[PDB]
């Protein structure tokens, strides 16, 4: 179900997760959960994985404005821009597929999915989101548009193949719905419909009810009944923090969007400071730039590297030996100064 | 491959003797090569009776024996059915397992069908909320089912709007099937005297609508 | 006869593989082989080899190497040809045979495999009944039209599946990469309309099905 992605979108009807602090600290099934993080990239590539169809239509055609919500208040198709991704900055997108979304974003302390699928504007099911660049290159700027360099990096290739890996779920979601059972006075009404019941026997094992079909209990309410939401139509892939009623499972699997592969890197390693050769030495005054790993390398010598990330004007006095200093400092190539009389 | 060659067209009569010919295209038969012919039931359900030059059929008419005829599987079958139209398969099983040649498909007389029994109405309003219209005009059990279908809503058959579904035959020669007039919803309101005018075997089925 | 419960009509996944079983029941035929038939497209039963009952031994023809598997799950009487090598130039019938009357004698089922690309829409069934003006004879022709099956399957039951004495049907036929037909039968004067002689359409692989009852527009 990745040749059309909607086969994998239809195998996994999404449900709410352990949304522990959506408001201040209000905790329940959160409708836009935080399932996994997919950020092993040197392409500045976050990926969020959660339990809604953010990248899967109802029939499964990837509607832009259809991002699929899924709850016991059921599967629906909420907005395409109204999915909140808040990393403490704007959740910039690179793409999205089903229960995943790959993106670039300058990081923070908390990622926060914001549930807004026409039942709300936002709801901030958040997570302690570490995200920091550690960028490539000698130079220290993250500005892609200037033309000064091209290094190698690895970024999330945004092609819509089926999978390289595949996450999945079974032992199915006996799930967060216990207010179904209709009121009998000392009995109960099995109010059947909408989903599968997952009942339990206290006075009568007809209180043990699976159904979208209703029944009767006599002499047993809560306290002598049992009711939970035990239905199907969802392969629930990564449900942590709300355990399934199954300790014994048979899962189904689906692939991983945005597979990380090799790319370039437009890195802006600009010109360094000014180098006057002196009476036995030489000296380059580095100006300010983006924070650049300067390396004055006595290349052949005892390699005390005049090397550090730099952000001010510094004074790289390379007293040049016969072995010759290498000013290869911050996003340029080297320079092999040989001392002379 | 192999060729146990006989008449791969087979034309029978009422109670008709399916003489499933297969003389050996290489030459002469044997029971180690298994020159056999067993008659084949509907939906391409070959069930081998006249087995390998040694057997008759289990529960079939008793006149059927796929045996040595010519230098191949000559299958003499006297006393066939009225609607037993199916593939009398000439199997050659060369001391390991049965591989097929062609097998003579046999279709006979006895019990010819009628005109196509008319189910021809513009169907319920589920398509008319989509801005569509698919009226169902068809026959049931037409025989000899050589169907001429003029499919044009608004009365006159034009090459669009019409549609033919699968007109499918049974074992007993009953072959009537459906089709539609497939146009718009307000376009299905634009014309109401549409249909599918069908005719097979001298019997003509009127698919006419009302809207 | 040790009769076949055939693997279904299946659209082909590309490069794919499975053990397409003709469940060869009627006994535990464990000392009994069969011809594991490939329903060739023109040729009919051009079987690419045979199965065994307990040995499971697939005798192999000269063409089924590559996309062929021999599968013999004969513990409850199952034989089968494995559809390996999913490609669009193979898709035909798949049958069995048990080896009684010592060549292949218990002629199996035959299930329609179709190697191909298909739709992302399965069939849908619609109720087409007697009209809001009349349409009323001794035979009142209705049913459900089950169309658009990309990929397979499609199956249409009459009377909601119960009152189905002869609901004449078109199977999945070609339209836009979707298998399409209609399963429609007559009700009597007392077959409908208050007695719900309803056309039910189904697509089990693509899961596109609905039962549309004995209720017309009048």
XYZ file of C-alpha atoms in Angstrom:
770
model
C 0.000 0.000 0.000
C 2.656 2.487 -1.122
C 2.160 2.239 -4.907
C -0.850 4.251 -3.961
C 0.009 5.423 -0.434
C -3.696 5.270 0.474
C -3.567 1.487 0.921
C -1.217 2.143 3.826
C -3.411 5.102 4.745
C -6.471 2.855 4.891
C -4.755 0.061 6.813
C -3.977 2.488 9.658
C -6.969 4.351 11.004
C -5.305 6.761 13.427
C -6.199 7.222 17.067
C -5.250 9.696 19.800
C -2.118 9.146 21.900
C -0.860 10.080 25.359
C -1.217 13.836 24.905
C 0.036 14.665 28.378
C 0.255 18.475 28.211
C -1.840 19.781 25.339
C -2.958 22.853 27.247
C -1.010 23.715 30.324
C -0.767 20.099 31.474
C -4.069 18.539 30.424
C -3.591 14.897 29.573
C -5.668 12.408 27.611
C -5.641 10.878 24.208
C -4.235 13.816 22.210
C -5.547 13.789 18.635
C -2.276 14.900 17.058
C 0.229 12.692 18.841
C 4.041 12.666 18.794
C 4.936 9.146 17.720
C 8.555 9.212 16.563
C 11.292 11.604 15.506
C 13.063 11.018 12.204
C 16.088 13.295 12.317
C 19.351 11.509 11.602
C 20.046 13.918 8.767
C 22.855 16.333 8.043
C 20.309 17.905 5.714
C 18.705 19.939 8.532
C 15.909 17.442 8.329
C 13.459 16.989 11.121
C 10.709 14.433 10.656
C 7.688 14.180 12.937
C 5.724 10.923 13.170
C 2.217 10.995 14.678
C -1.164 9.238 14.537
C -3.053 11.423 11.986
C -3.193 11.269 8.176
C -0.966 14.291 7.513
C -0.207 13.223 3.988
C -2.997 10.719 3.263
C -6.481 11.380 1.926
C -9.639 9.565 3.005
C -9.588 7.496 -0.159
C -5.868 8.209 -0.048
C -5.217 10.700 -2.819
C -2.828 13.154 -1.228
C -5.069 16.185 -0.882
C -3.128 19.277 0.101
C -5.926 20.779 2.221
C -6.886 17.327 3.497
C -4.677 16.367 6.407
C -6.433 13.436 8.045
C -7.379 13.726 11.703
C -8.286 10.518 13.509
C -10.008 10.124 16.865
C -12.786 8.209 18.672
C -14.495 11.327 17.726
C -13.538 9.694 14.481
C -11.375 9.872 11.353
C -11.933 13.166 9.514
C -10.071 15.351 7.014
C -9.006 18.633 8.608
C -6.946 21.448 7.103
C -3.660 21.359 5.216
C -2.070 24.524 6.572
C -3.911 24.205 9.914
C -1.662 21.434 11.204
C 0.491 23.180 13.770
C 4.179 22.295 13.889
C 5.823 24.479 16.534
C 9.449 23.749 17.379
C 9.777 27.143 19.094
C 10.003 28.343 15.482
C 7.858 27.929 12.390
C 7.595 24.312 11.298
C 8.891 24.653 7.737
C 7.866 21.721 5.571
C 9.782 19.574 3.126
C 6.921 17.110 2.681
C 4.613 14.725 4.460
C 3.258 11.210 4.002
C 0.549 9.534 6.073
C 1.725 9.454 9.668
C 5.022 11.250 8.908
C 6.215 14.746 7.917
C 9.749 15.786 6.941
C 10.814 19.410 7.255
C 13.497 21.962 7.980
C 13.190 24.049 11.130
C 15.592 25.932 13.395
C 15.196 23.982 16.609
C 14.285 24.666 20.217
C 13.304 22.885 23.378
C 9.820 21.643 22.520
C 8.212 20.439 19.350
C 4.452 20.797 19.520
C 1.888 19.381 17.137
C -1.158 21.632 17.140
C -4.477 19.919 16.524
C -6.699 22.149 14.430
C -8.799 19.884 12.163
C -11.969 22.026 12.243
C -12.758 20.875 15.794
C -10.315 23.441 17.154
C -7.762 26.005 16.055
C -4.801 24.369 17.763
C -4.001 21.986 20.591
C -0.368 21.768 21.568
C 0.513 18.142 22.149
C 4.179 18.852 22.737
C 7.457 17.052 23.352
C 10.933 17.908 24.609
C 12.361 18.508 21.162
C 16.130 18.721 20.969
C 17.159 19.970 17.524
C 20.418 21.751 16.698
C 22.240 21.970 13.336
C 25.945 21.196 13.850
C 26.388 22.404 10.274
C 28.849 21.293 7.628
C 31.826 23.238 6.341
C 34.678 25.290 7.682
C 32.468 28.411 7.506
C 29.736 29.043 10.083
C 26.711 30.388 8.231
C 23.349 28.848 7.537
C 22.350 30.932 4.528
C 21.729 28.714 1.515
C 21.050 31.430 -1.093
C 24.521 32.983 -1.321
C 26.745 31.326 -3.884
C 30.089 30.468 -2.378
C 30.485 26.689 -1.907
C 29.188 23.146 -2.346
C 30.104 20.462 0.225
C 28.663 16.956 0.664
C 25.796 16.329 3.112
C 22.903 13.909 3.616
C 19.272 15.015 3.417
C 15.837 13.417 3.325
C 15.182 12.437 -0.271
C 11.548 13.366 -0.795
C 10.563 10.660 -3.286
C 7.332 8.724 -2.808
C 8.574 5.168 -2.801
C 6.925 2.527 -0.596
C 9.514 2.227 2.187
C 13.089 1.481 3.129
C 11.847 0.361 6.556
C 8.224 -0.181 7.712
C 6.552 0.562 11.072
C 3.232 -1.083 11.954
C 0.748 -2.306 14.584
C -1.730 -5.061 15.549
C -3.143 -6.633 18.710
C -5.660 -4.044 17.869
C -6.684 -0.845 19.612
C -8.996 -1.702 22.403
C -9.140 2.025 22.670
C -10.159 5.060 24.694
C -13.943 4.854 24.598
C -15.857 3.719 27.686
C -18.811 6.155 27.731
C -20.719 4.129 25.116
C -22.874 1.966 27.447
C -26.392 3.386 27.680
C -28.155 3.881 30.976
C -30.238 1.139 32.471
C -31.240 1.935 36.050
C -29.571 -1.039 37.680
C -29.215 -2.754 34.373
C -27.537 -1.250 31.371
C -28.347 -0.618 27.754
C -25.730 -1.882 25.365
C -25.774 1.236 23.189
C -24.302 -0.407 20.122
C -22.956 1.344 17.081
C -20.184 3.582 15.832
C -17.352 1.184 16.704
C -16.617 -2.126 18.372
C -17.559 -2.617 21.996
C -15.057 -4.314 24.284
C -17.223 -5.284 27.199
C -16.662 -7.313 30.360
C -18.813 -9.583 32.503
C -19.889 -8.742 36.040
C -23.604 -9.647 36.109
C -23.937 -11.526 32.854
C -21.310 -12.279 30.201
C -23.526 -10.437 27.715
C -21.913 -7.558 29.530
C -18.849 -9.042 27.786
C -19.785 -7.305 24.564
C -18.036 -6.829 21.296
C -20.422 -5.044 18.941
C -21.658 -2.156 16.968
C -24.918 -3.789 18.159
C -26.693 -3.011 21.396
C -28.120 -5.251 24.107
C -29.324 -5.355 27.698
C -27.723 -5.845 31.089
C -29.802 -6.519 34.185
C -28.570 -5.773 37.704
C -25.169 -4.479 36.617
C -24.017 -0.960 35.826
C -20.424 0.068 35.940
C -19.814 -2.049 38.905
C -20.887 -5.383 37.359
C -20.501 -4.478 33.735
C -17.528 -3.778 31.515
C -17.225 -1.510 28.488
C -14.246 -0.275 26.462
C -13.752 0.711 22.825
C -12.529 -2.462 21.135
C -12.842 -2.254 17.355
C -10.871 -2.589 14.109
C -10.230 -0.738 10.835
C -6.918 0.561 12.179
C -3.428 -0.805 12.169
C -2.183 1.397 15.008
C 1.562 1.551 14.378
C 3.356 3.145 17.284
C 1.068 3.513 20.273
C 3.206 4.270 23.328
C 1.886 5.757 26.603
C -1.553 4.181 26.117
C -1.077 0.399 25.997
C -3.202 -1.838 23.817
C -5.411 -4.460 25.410
C -3.307 -6.980 23.416
C -0.158 -8.296 25.016
C -0.232 -10.662 22.022
C -0.206 -8.973 18.605
C -0.156 -9.587 14.871
C 0.991 -6.361 13.288
C 0.720 -4.744 9.894
C 3.475 -2.534 8.513
C 3.881 0.562 6.302
C 6.874 2.394 4.922
C 8.966 5.390 5.952
C 8.545 8.752 4.162
C 11.456 10.988 3.120
C 14.344 8.489 2.835
C 17.644 10.158 3.693
C 20.328 10.000 0.979
C 23.272 12.053 -0.216
C 23.066 15.698 -1.310
C 25.315 18.739 -1.733
C 25.562 21.805 0.482
C 25.656 25.445 -0.607
C 27.961 26.620 2.204
C 29.070 30.272 2.305
C 32.782 30.209 3.097
C 33.713 33.824 2.385
C 37.072 35.585 2.238
C 39.280 35.548 5.313
C 41.379 38.360 6.827
C 44.463 40.202 5.682
C 47.907 38.619 5.810
C 51.085 40.670 6.039
C 54.314 38.687 6.192
C 56.608 40.119 8.861
C 60.149 40.098 10.136
C 60.302 36.370 10.767
C 56.562 35.654 10.846
C 53.281 36.462 9.104
C 49.883 37.568 10.344
C 46.330 37.327 9.039
C 43.742 39.496 10.792
C 40.501 37.547 10.395
C 37.409 39.734 10.275
C 33.964 38.699 11.536
C 31.852 36.199 9.570
C 29.563 33.293 10.382
C 31.182 31.203 13.161
C 34.042 29.574 11.342
C 36.466 26.817 12.355
C 39.723 28.637 11.579
C 42.767 26.408 11.164
C 46.256 27.807 10.900
C 48.084 24.550 10.411
C 51.838 24.306 10.617
C 51.552 21.565 8.075
C 54.374 19.168 8.768
C 55.349 20.670 12.089
C 54.367 19.798 15.618
C 50.709 20.430 14.866
C 49.594 22.895 17.468
C 46.680 24.040 15.328
C 45.748 27.695 15.579
C 42.251 26.388 15.254
C 38.890 27.245 16.731
C 35.446 28.416 15.692
C 35.888 32.171 15.364
C 33.407 35.044 15.304
C 35.469 38.216 15.908
C 38.555 39.808 14.442
C 41.449 37.522 15.357
C 45.190 37.688 14.758
C 46.497 34.482 13.189
C 50.202 35.128 13.530
C 51.652 32.114 11.783
C 55.383 32.367 12.384
C 56.156 30.420 9.249
C 58.660 27.613 9.400
C 60.379 25.751 6.619
C 57.465 23.288 7.000
C 55.136 26.161 6.137
C 51.876 27.230 7.706
C 48.576 26.233 6.133
C 45.928 28.896 6.427
C 42.978 26.659 5.629
C 40.542 28.359 7.926
C 36.822 28.589 7.511
C 35.250 27.626 4.220
C 38.095 28.328 1.847
C 40.789 25.954 0.608
C 44.247 25.860 2.189
C 47.161 28.229 1.697
C 50.697 26.942 2.146
C 52.896 29.846 3.217
C 56.621 29.188 3.089
C 58.901 31.473 5.068
C 61.449 33.580 3.204
C 64.128 36.203 3.806
C 5.241 -28.442 -25.742
C 3.334 -31.058 -27.779
C 0.593 -31.414 -30.420
C -1.913 -34.269 -30.184
C -3.726 -32.849 -33.177
C -7.401 -33.212 -33.975
C -10.282 -30.918 -34.791
C -9.874 -28.165 -32.179
C -13.296 -26.915 -33.203
C -16.044 -29.254 -32.026
C -19.660 -29.042 -33.180
C -22.265 -31.364 -31.654
C -26.041 -32.038 -31.794
C -28.835 -32.884 -29.327
C -27.582 -35.950 -27.490
C -24.503 -35.375 -29.636
C -21.482 -37.649 -29.936
C -18.431 -35.632 -28.942
C -15.870 -37.458 -31.070
C -12.869 -35.669 -29.587
C -10.333 -36.284 -32.300
C -6.657 -36.084 -31.609
C -4.489 -38.172 -33.928
C -0.863 -37.935 -32.824
C 0.895 -35.141 -34.719
C 4.182 -36.941 -34.143
C 2.603 -40.311 -34.959
C 1.212 -43.162 -32.919
C -0.325 -43.341 -29.442
C 0.511 -45.410 -26.373
C -0.667 -45.698 -22.760
C 2.748 -44.516 -21.529
C 2.166 -41.258 -23.428
C -1.456 -41.268 -22.182
C -3.595 -40.383 -25.177
C -6.758 -39.435 -23.307
C -9.777 -37.150 -23.652
C -12.064 -36.102 -20.809
C -14.986 -33.715 -21.247
C -14.850 -30.263 -19.676
C -17.671 -28.566 -17.716
C -18.692 -24.921 -17.456
C -16.377 -22.049 -16.573
C -13.473 -23.979 -18.156
C -13.780 -26.794 -15.601
C -11.989 -29.649 -17.333
C -12.593 -32.863 -15.448
C -10.840 -35.730 -17.170
C -12.935 -38.842 -17.604
C -11.644 -40.785 -20.602
C -8.334 -41.210 -18.986
C -5.086 -41.908 -20.786
C -6.590 -44.529 -23.070
C -7.839 -46.642 -20.166
C -10.884 -45.195 -18.366
C -14.387 -43.763 -18.659
C -15.939 -40.860 -16.735
C -17.123 -40.991 -13.138
C -20.817 -40.160 -13.124
C -21.009 -38.954 -16.739
C -22.979 -40.414 -19.654
C -21.665 -43.907 -20.262
C -20.958 -43.467 -23.987
C -17.765 -41.442 -23.320
C -14.359 -43.082 -23.675
C -11.091 -41.307 -24.405
C -9.018 -44.129 -25.841
C -6.723 -45.046 -28.728
C -8.248 -43.608 -31.919
C -6.042 -43.077 -34.955
C -2.589 -42.777 -33.451
C -3.763 -40.498 -30.631
C -6.544 -39.829 -28.175
C -9.737 -40.666 -30.029
C -12.525 -39.899 -27.573
C -15.800 -41.455 -28.667
C -18.601 -39.897 -26.600
C -22.120 -40.978 -27.623
C -25.120 -39.528 -25.810
C -24.061 -36.053 -24.678
C -26.091 -33.337 -22.976
C -28.302 -30.570 -24.322
C -26.447 -27.845 -22.420
C -23.104 -29.553 -21.787
C -21.039 -26.984 -23.767
C -17.462 -27.214 -22.514
C -13.906 -28.124 -23.515
C -13.390 -31.834 -24.167
C -9.720 -31.833 -23.255
C -7.226 -34.100 -24.987
C -4.596 -34.699 -22.337
C -1.248 -36.327 -23.116
C 0.488 -37.648 -19.999
C 3.901 -38.980 -20.960
C 4.678 -41.224 -17.977
C 5.091 -38.348 -15.514
C 2.086 -36.034 -15.732
C -0.706 -34.710 -17.913
C 0.179 -31.853 -20.255
C -2.515 -30.464 -22.522
C -2.667 -29.890 -26.217
C -5.597 -27.876 -27.477
C -8.762 -29.781 -26.552
C -11.907 -29.580 -28.645
C -14.458 -27.122 -27.283
C -17.867 -28.734 -27.850
C -21.129 -26.777 -28.157
C -24.218 -28.667 -29.264
C -27.922 -28.478 -30.051
C -30.815 -29.165 -27.711
C -32.469 -26.398 -25.717
C -31.848 -23.136 -27.593
C -32.557 -19.936 -25.638
C -34.966 -17.062 -26.326
C -34.763 -13.347 -26.895
C -33.088 -11.387 -24.078
C -35.547 -11.119 -21.154
C -35.958 -7.397 -20.757
C -34.615 -5.587 -17.725
C -34.506 -2.124 -19.272
C -35.124 0.801 -16.911
C -33.447 4.102 -15.989
C -32.185 3.276 -12.517
C -32.558 4.904 -9.115
C -31.479 8.428 -8.288
C -28.037 7.676 -6.751
C -26.271 8.735 -9.948
C -28.469 11.849 -10.348
C -26.926 13.417 -7.226
C -23.444 12.994 -8.709
C -24.489 14.821 -11.896
C -24.559 11.440 -13.651
C -27.039 8.934 -15.036
C -26.553 5.228 -15.731
C -29.790 3.580 -16.827
C -29.636 -0.236 -16.968
C -30.877 -1.787 -20.232
C -30.306 -5.504 -20.730
C -31.585 -8.959 -21.605
C -31.549 -12.185 -19.566
C -30.999 -15.621 -21.162
C -31.043 -14.607 -24.846
C -30.399 -17.346 -27.428
C -28.888 -17.335 -30.212
C -27.414 -14.319 -28.508
C -26.163 -12.171 -31.382
C -26.902 -8.879 -29.661
C -27.518 -5.708 -31.618
C -27.521 -2.861 -29.098
C -28.447 0.703 -30.030
C -27.394 2.649 -26.958
C -28.243 6.347 -27.075
C -30.189 8.230 -24.412
C -32.471 10.790 -26.039
C -33.836 7.995 -28.232
C -31.373 7.928 -31.128
C -28.269 5.741 -30.883
C -25.133 7.871 -30.898
C -21.729 6.318 -30.181
C -21.369 7.971 -26.756
C -23.757 7.712 -23.820
C -24.378 4.010 -24.385
C -22.519 1.174 -22.714
C -22.722 -2.610 -22.894
C -21.934 -4.813 -19.928
C -20.919 -8.406 -20.208
C -23.550 -10.476 -22.000
C -22.642 -13.866 -20.552
C -23.825 -17.317 -21.621
C -24.570 -20.291 -19.376
C -24.115 -24.009 -20.033
C -27.667 -24.351 -21.406
C -27.215 -21.582 -24.044
C -28.822 -18.724 -22.098
C -26.869 -15.558 -22.880
C -28.484 -12.274 -21.974
C -26.671 -9.496 -20.159
C -26.830 -5.830 -19.345
C -25.556 -2.414 -20.297
C -26.313 1.214 -19.470
C -26.966 4.665 -20.810
C -24.220 6.655 -19.052
C -24.669 10.449 -19.344
C -25.107 13.479 -17.054
C -27.560 14.164 -14.224
C -29.163 17.298 -15.580
C -28.050 15.748 -18.873
C -30.095 12.715 -17.805
C -32.834 15.258 -17.159
C -32.227 16.760 -20.634
C -33.355 13.521 -22.235
C -35.781 11.086 -20.626
C -36.982 8.951 -23.564
C -33.694 7.044 -23.781
C -32.962 3.331 -23.668
C -30.882 0.481 -25.013
C -32.596 -1.225 -27.952
C -31.283 -4.800 -27.951
C -32.013 -7.758 -30.233
C -30.689 -11.336 -30.145
C -31.955 -14.494 -31.866
C -35.042 -12.852 -33.343
C -36.115 -11.594 -29.932
C -35.822 -7.876 -29.269
C -35.508 -6.411 -25.783
C -36.702 -2.850 -25.292
C -34.670 -0.859 -22.791
C -36.698 2.338 -22.421
C -36.595 4.872 -19.593
C -38.948 7.402 -18.006
C -37.711 10.622 -16.429
C -13.473 -36.144 -6.127
C -10.743 -34.518 -4.045
C -12.052 -31.158 -5.041
C -10.431 -27.737 -5.262
C -11.023 -24.627 -3.176
C -9.238 -22.211 -5.474
C -7.224 -19.135 -4.697
C -9.122 -16.085 -5.768
C -9.104 -13.647 -8.607
C -6.063 -11.548 -7.800
C -4.525 -8.551 -9.521
C -0.772 -8.919 -9.595
C 1.709 -7.016 -7.499
C 4.844 -6.330 -9.558
C 7.621 -8.822 -8.897
C 5.365 -10.418 -6.286
C 5.036 -13.981 -4.983
C 2.471 -16.099 -3.128
C 1.386 -19.743 -2.853
C -1.861 -19.705 -4.867
C -3.593 -22.701 -3.372
C -6.147 -24.981 -4.882
C -7.169 -26.600 -1.588
C -7.385 -30.213 -2.689
C -9.884 -31.542 -0.172
C -12.056 -34.623 -0.258
C -9.458 -36.462 1.808
C -5.864 -36.362 2.927
C -4.502 -37.301 -0.511
C -0.929 -37.563 0.842
C 0.097 -40.522 -1.339
C -1.691 -38.977 -4.328
C -0.224 -36.427 -6.751
C -2.075 -34.094 -9.077
C -1.604 -31.818 -12.051
C -1.166 -28.282 -10.708
C -2.805 -26.578 -13.647
C -2.064 -23.181 -15.093
C -5.127 -22.016 -17.001
C -3.227 -20.655 -20.037
C -4.947 -17.628 -21.660
C -5.812 -19.233 -24.960
C -4.652 -22.788 -24.383
C -6.992 -23.683 -21.549
C -5.404 -26.148 -19.168
C -1.744 -25.769 -20.056
C -0.493 -27.016 -16.696
C 3.167 -26.186 -16.065
C 3.591 -29.242 -13.865
C 2.027 -31.324 -11.158
C 1.745 -31.277 -7.374
C 1.962 -34.080 -4.798
C -0.306 -34.660 -1.789
C 2.221 -35.341 1.004
C 5.448 -35.286 -0.991
C 4.158 -32.045 -2.534
C 6.285 -32.810 -5.620
C 5.884 -30.153 -8.319
C 6.717 -31.593 -11.680
C 7.781 -28.607 -13.751
C 7.039 -27.595 -17.317
C 9.527 -25.856 -19.575
C 8.116 -22.329 -19.271
C 7.046 -21.811 -15.644
C 10.620 -21.455 -14.361
C 10.925 -17.931 -13.097
C 7.408 -16.971 -12.062
C 6.345 -20.429 -10.805
C 6.309 -21.931 -7.314
C 5.327 -25.452 -6.290
C 3.405 -25.346 -3.006
C 1.934 -28.391 -1.335
C 0.209 -27.736 1.986
C -1.493 -31.127 1.828
C -1.933 -31.481 5.606
C -5.585 -30.451 5.260
C -5.598 -31.246 1.527
C -4.113 -28.117 -0.041
C -2.043 -28.013 -3.223
C -1.127 -24.911 -5.158
C 0.888 -23.087 -7.757
C 2.841 -20.185 -6.298
C 2.440 -16.997 -8.321
C 6.007 -15.745 -8.174
C 7.505 -13.169 -10.556
C 4.736 -10.578 -10.707
C 4.589 -9.175 -14.243
C 1.790 -8.122 -16.580
C 2.475 -10.825 -19.188
C 1.321 -13.850 -17.182
C -2.177 -13.248 -15.826
C -4.452 -16.254 -16.416
C -6.485 -18.970 -14.654
C -4.915 -21.111 -11.924
C -6.347 -24.595 -11.377
C -5.583 -27.926 -9.759
C -6.098 -31.627 -10.280
C -5.807 -34.650 -7.988
C -4.335 -37.849 -9.411
C -7.242 -40.297 -9.360
C -7.577 -42.537 -12.333
C -3.854 -42.446 -12.012
C -3.235 -39.344 -14.121
C -4.699 -35.974 -13.043
C -8.386 -36.662 -12.458
C -9.936 -34.498 -9.718
C -10.164 -31.264 -11.689
C -9.547 -28.297 -9.410
C -11.024 -24.851 -9.224
C -9.272 -22.274 -11.332
C -8.909 -18.728 -10.034
C -8.345 -15.684 -12.213
C -4.980 -14.044 -11.639
C -4.373 -10.925 -13.729
C -0.844 -9.520 -13.858
C -1.182 -5.788 -14.343
C -1.390 -2.266 -13.066
C -4.844 -1.486 -11.676
C -6.912 1.283 -10.113
C -6.999 2.690 -6.570
C -10.783 2.283 -6.679
C -12.542 -1.041 -6.219
C -16.081 -1.816 -7.419
C -19.214 -0.146 -6.116
C -22.669 -1.764 -6.217
C -25.834 0.242 -6.872
C -29.514 -0.775 -6.579
C -31.397 -0.817 -9.881
C -34.987 -1.928 -9.225
C -38.532 -1.587 -10.604
C -39.451 2.005 -11.307
C -41.226 4.900 -9.603
C -43.581 4.601 -12.541
C -44.569 0.943 -12.806
C -41.939 -1.472 -14.207
C -44.271 -4.071 -12.788
C -44.832 -7.496 -14.284
C -44.647 -11.080 -13.170
C -40.874 -10.564 -13.406
C -39.579 -7.353 -11.833
C -35.977 -7.004 -12.926
C -33.622 -5.463 -10.389
C -30.258 -6.045 -8.801
C -27.043 -4.261 -7.981
C -24.529 -3.015 -10.560
C -20.995 -3.676 -9.249
C -18.506 -1.626 -11.253
C -14.989 -0.281 -11.338
C -12.946 -2.985 -9.624
C -9.302 -1.971 -9.765
C -7.852 -4.458 -8.849
C -9.913 -7.626 -8.376
C -12.189 -8.986 -6.890
C -15.931 -8.460 -7.525
C -18.874 -10.690 -6.514
C -22.611 -9.982 -6.655
C -25.207 -11.831 -4.563
C -28.965 -11.728 -5.096
C -31.782 -11.119 -2.587
C -29.210 -9.667 -0.210
C -27.334 -12.943 -0.713
C -30.242 -15.173 0.287
C -33.056 -14.681 -2.277
C -30.651 -15.306 -5.153
C -32.265 -17.905 -7.387
C -30.463 -16.967 -10.590
C -29.390 -13.316 -10.399
C -27.694 -13.198 -13.808
C -24.394 -11.399 -13.659
C -21.645 -9.782 -15.580
C -18.308 -10.279 -13.806
C -15.450 -7.828 -13.612
C -14.939 -6.648 -17.207
C -12.559 -4.020 -18.560
C -13.309 -0.344 -18.009
C -10.492 2.090 -17.194
C -8.500 -0.582 -15.397
C -11.581 -1.406 -13.337
C -13.484 -4.664 -13.448
C -17.153 -3.854 -13.905
C -20.458 -5.692 -14.348
C -23.927 -5.981 -12.856
C -25.590 -8.781 -10.915
C -29.303 -8.472 -11.541
C -32.162 -10.919 -11.336
C -35.931 -10.750 -11.395
C -38.081 -10.834 -8.321
C -41.567 -12.204 -8.791
C -44.769 -10.440 -7.991
C -44.159 -11.823 -4.489
C -40.363 -11.674 -4.781
C -40.462 -7.877 -4.253
C -40.784 -5.086 -3.232
C -42.041 -5.403 0.325
C -40.097 -8.654 0.490
C -36.627 -7.188 0.259
C -35.121 -8.896 -2.795
C -32.029 -6.712 -2.689
C -29.018 -6.657 -4.982
C -25.783 -6.956 -2.980
C -22.475 -6.044 -4.656
C -19.051 -6.874 -3.196
C -15.335 -6.363 -3.829
C -13.400 -8.466 -1.291
C -9.822 -7.572 -2.221
C -10.429 -3.870 -2.842
C -13.227 -3.952 -0.238
C -15.880 -2.130 -2.252
C -19.298 -3.553 -1.381
C -22.853 -2.512 -0.510
C -26.209 -4.274 -0.105
C -28.967 -2.190 -1.751
C -32.313 -3.549 -0.682
C -35.689 -4.281 -2.233
C -36.752 -0.638 -2.299
C -37.344 1.280 -5.494
C -38.288 4.887 -6.210
C -41.987 3.875 -5.919
